[PDB]
Amino acid sequence: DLKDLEAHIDSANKNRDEAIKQLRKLQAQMKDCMRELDDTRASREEILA
Amino acid sequence: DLKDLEAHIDSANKNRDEAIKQLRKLQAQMKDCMRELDDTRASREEILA
């Protein structure tokens, strides 16, 4: 049980890394989309107008 | 130590929940920006023409 919980801790930490890894990639992707959406909405709305 | 491992699993799972909670709010914003960019892509590509 100790080794099972120890291995489970690695799986729990590994599972947390998966969600954290996606958050890191999603954050970089969201920031790029948010930054682009800011310049695009500020430029496209002006260039299209 | 077995009971102590449960705290690490709870703490590790708690940290993953925090990242998942923040990722959920950020993942939704990323998809929202893509929708505006997609709508602006066709418009900027056609309105500019």
UniProtKB/Swiss-Prot annotation, chains A, B:
Signal peptide stretch: none
Modified residues (N6-acetyllysine): K21
Subcellular location(s) per record: Cytoplasm, Cytoskeleton; Cytoplasm, Cell cortex; Cytoplasmic vesicle, Secretory vesicle, Cortical granule; Cell membrane
Tissue: In the kidney, expressed in the glomeruli. Also expressed in leukocytes.
Domain of life: Eukaryota
Modification comment: ISGylated. Ubiquitination.
Quaternary structure (record): Myosin is a hexameric protein that consists of 2 heavy chain subunits (MHC), 2 alkali light chain subunits (MLC) and 2 regulatory light chain subunits (MLC-2). Interacts with RASIP1. Interacts with DDR1. Interacts with PDLIM2. Interacts with SVIL. Interacts with HTRA3. Interacts with Myo7a. Interacts with CFAP95. Interacts with LIMCH1; independently of the integration of MYH9 into the myosin complex. Interacts with RAB3A. Interacts with ZBED4. Interacts with S100A4; this interaction increases cell motility. (Microbial infection) Interacts with herpes simplex virus 1/HHV-1 envelope glycoprotein B.
Role: Cellular myosin that appears to play a role in cytokinesis, cell shape, and specialized functions such as secretion and capping. Required for cortical actin clearance prior to oocyte exocytosis. Promotes cell motility in conjunction with S100A4. During cell spreading, plays an important role in cytoskeleton reorganization, focal contact formation (in the margins but not the central part of spreading cells), and lamellipodial retraction; this function is mechanically antagonized by MYH10.
UniProt remark on domains: The rodlike tail sequence is highly repetitive, showing cycles of a 28-residue repeat pattern composed of 4 heptapeptides, characteristic for alpha-helical coiled coils.
Disease note: Macrothrombocytopenia and granulocyte inclusions with or without nephritis or sensorineural hearing loss: An autosomal dominant disorder characterized by thrombocytopenia, giant platelets and Dohle body-like inclusions in peripheral blood leukocytes with variable ultrastructural appearance. Some affected individuals lack leukocyte inclusion bodies on classic staining of peripheral blood smears. Alport syndrome-like features of nephritis, hearing loss, and eye abnormalities are present in some patients.
Family as reported in the entry's similarity comment: Belongs to the TRAFAC class myosin-kinesin ATPase superfamily. Myosin family.
Name the UniProt record assigns to this protein: Myosin-9
UniProt source species: Homo sapiens (Human)
Region of the whole protein represented: 1618 to 1666 of 1960
